[PDB]
């Protein structure tokens, strides 16, 4: 039912309006119970997230507590590590750009609060290189914090030691991937690894490692402060907590609001943000989780609401919860076509199914926009789509297939007409 | 992806980190874990790019040298990332975001305007060697869709003439107020701040017991 209270809202500094710097952060009281929390114990911190039942705030959804629990196993003589990926290459994920730029500190204490939960020696934050200015803001914030002694050895007047670092991204969406963030951190080409050697087991520099969406690291200190329950209540069943929602494209006031999860999709454009540009009936389709997730047409649009369980029922993913909206004024065949162009210019090429498959769909999709291709080809793109979906080394091939599948699933008649249109003029 | 040695772009172009640059280098390595020079190549390659935009084959060889890694190792890193430029870069190097979010909100619109203003095709440097336009992909900051990152200018929410205005500012003078030239602040509902219009609770507000 959304409509979270401002007091409950996590990032009060969202939209700025409060000094992103430490003195603004102190008025925010972000560093209020940090010593106590760490003192309580690592086990106490994970109890808090397990009670919260928080799901991954990045595109993949998994219990946050269980993921952190995995490398809570005893150290084998290799320093455990924390990796925070501030890269958000996915379209509509300007969300994480907020916490980093507007409220850098929340993430800094998120890092050490999270750090003792996994007993990480240190945390590296991979902010996308594109955001150079953004980087300027966080290390100013990180510098403040150590000057204070909030972070560093004996951080926050406690036995525990932590050091936080910022790493430059270099314009790659794939760098975002969990195994590939590591390799970029390692300095090799940004190519994902296979999951068998799991990230905790062989992390970075062969030292256990864990990767979290910046939102996931940022909420952990406030969730421990507010307790898992407070946070647990807002969510729906497995779904829980407020997740920032970004609405971009064909809406009167595109904005990122951290309104509550489980929001009726019709409600968030209509009530907050801006009602769909041109009217709620001028909605050819909604992209709920960003480019990777399949778009849902207006028919199912309001019925369903934004929570991961409800979306998977709907065949779409909450993902980064980036709402991209397409009025009846858009050539979807071309809209999704550029997302496949978005993925041919970006997939690493390490795996055969994504390399040739994504390029193959790009060629077919461009012909589909022209209408040159015959109607029978449509289904083949589908068959090409699932070959890529289950065979890829990473999830990006998973992601490339879904928008193609969505276009065929709900807009098959329109593509046939574009097929028909070209055949008629000869 | 092949460096055919050319008089301009080839090692005859000597490269060496400024005494100041070399300093920056050491710092980088330490930031990274002990005994792991390799992690520092993407940052060290970035400072070679900071030094000079061209970053020729000579510059990459130096990077490998300073970082004591297989030279190819540096060559592979430079080729994989779009951030690094292996060819000369225009002073301004504007990049226009053309992913679906920006296109839906008119990103394409901007392009046509910029091509005419720079009076040049998309993808190459102006004769003045002062501007370079490229159709880059999602640069983040989608809520503000119309967008053009010029060397981190990340101007956003830009109407066509806005850019023209910006380009002129760049063409005569400098620092043209980089950022969303729109009235809104950072990302904010154009209407206002529905999320939080109240004052923020202070330190230790409703902090749970335990």
């Amino acid at each position: 039912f959304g409509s979270l209270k401002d007091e409950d809202r996590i990032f009060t500094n969202l939209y700025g309006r409060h000094d992103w710097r430490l003195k603004g952060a102190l008025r925010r009281g972000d560093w209020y119970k940090t010593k106590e929390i760490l003192l309580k114990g690592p086990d106490w911190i994970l109890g808090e997230m397990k009670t919260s039942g928080l799901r991954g705030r990045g595109g993949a959804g998994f219990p946050t507590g269980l993921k952190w629990s995995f490398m809570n196993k005893p150290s084998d003589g290799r320093p455990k590590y924390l990796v925070v990926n501030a890269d958000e290459g996915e379209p509509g994920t300007c969300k994480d750009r907020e916490i980093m730029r507007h409220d850098p500190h929340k993430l800094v204490e998120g890092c050490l609060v999270g750090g003792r939960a996994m007993g990480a020696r240190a945390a590296y934050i991979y902010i996308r290189g594109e955001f150079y200015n953004e980087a300027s803001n966080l290390q100013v914030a990180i510098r403040e914090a150590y000057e204070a002694g909030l972070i560093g050895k004996n951080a926050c007047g406690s036995d525990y030691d932590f050091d936080v670092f910022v790493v430059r991204g270099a314009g790659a969406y794939i760098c975002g991937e969990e195994t590939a963030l590591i390799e970029s951190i390692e300095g090799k080409q940004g190519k994902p690894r296979l999951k068998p050697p799991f990230p905790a087991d062989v992390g970075v520099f062969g030292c256990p490692t864990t990767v979290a969406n910046v939102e996931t690291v940022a909420v952990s200190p406030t969730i421990c402060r507010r307790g898992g329950t407070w946070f647990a209540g807002f969510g729906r069943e497995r779904n829980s907590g407020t997740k920032l929602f970004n609405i971009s494209g064909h809406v009167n006031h595109p904005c990122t609001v951290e309104e509550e999860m489980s929001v009726p999709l019709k409600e968030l454009i209509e009530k907050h943000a801006g009602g769909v540009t041109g009217g709620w009936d001028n909605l050819l389709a909604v992209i709920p989780g960003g480019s990777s997730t399949p778009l849902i047409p207006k028919s199912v649009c309001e019925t369903v609401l934004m929570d991961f369980d409800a979306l998977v029922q709907a065949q779409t993913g909450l993902g980064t919860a980036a709402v991209i909206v397409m009025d009846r004024s858009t050539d979807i065949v071309k809209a999704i076509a550029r997302l496949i162009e978005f993925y041919k210019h970006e997939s690493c090429g390490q795996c055969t199914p994504c390399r040739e498959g994504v390029d193959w769909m790009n060629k077919v999709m461009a012909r589909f926009v022209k209408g040159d291709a015959r109607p029978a080809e449509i289904d083949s793109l589908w068959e090409i789509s699932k070959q890529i979906e289950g065979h890829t080394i990473c999830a990006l091939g998973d992601g490339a297939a879904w928008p193609v599948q969505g276009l065929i699933r709900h807009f098959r008649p329109e593509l046939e007409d574009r097929m028909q249109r070209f055949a008629q003029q000869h | 992806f092949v460096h055919r040695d050319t008089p301009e772009n080839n090692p005859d172009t000597p490269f060496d980190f400024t005494p100041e640059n070399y300093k920056r280098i050491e710092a980088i390595v330490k930031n990274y874990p002990e005994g792991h020079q390799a992690a520092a190549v993407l940052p060290v390659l970035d400072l070679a790019q900071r030094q000079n935009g061209w970053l020729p084959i000579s510059a990459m060889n130096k990077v490998a040298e300073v970082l004591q890694v297989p030279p190819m190792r540096v060559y592979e890193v430079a080729t994989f990332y779009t951030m690094y430029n292996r060819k000369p870069v225009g002073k301004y190097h504007i990049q226009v975001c053309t992913t679906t979010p920006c296109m839906l909100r008119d990103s394409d619109s901007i392009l046509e305007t910029l091509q005419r203003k720079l009076g040049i095709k998309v993808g190459e440097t102006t004769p003045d060697k002062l501007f370079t336009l490229i159709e880059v992909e999602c640069l983040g900051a989608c809520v503000n869709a119309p967008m053009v990152q010029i060397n981190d200018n990340y101007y956003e929410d830009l109407t066509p003439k806005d850019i023209e205005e910006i380009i002129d500012e760049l063409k005569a003078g400098k620092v043209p107020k980089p950022g969303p030239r729109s009235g809104r602040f950072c990302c904010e509902p154009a209407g206002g701040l529905t999320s939080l219009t109240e004052p923020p609770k202070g330190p230790g507000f409703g902090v749970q017991a335990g």
Binding site: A135, Q139, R143 | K23, R24, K30, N31, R50
Partner: peptide
């Protein structure tokens, strides 16, 4: 500044 992020790194170091 082109090197401001990098200069900010040395102080942290």
């Amino acid at each position: 500044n082109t090197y401001t992020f990098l200069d900010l790194n040395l102080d942290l170091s």
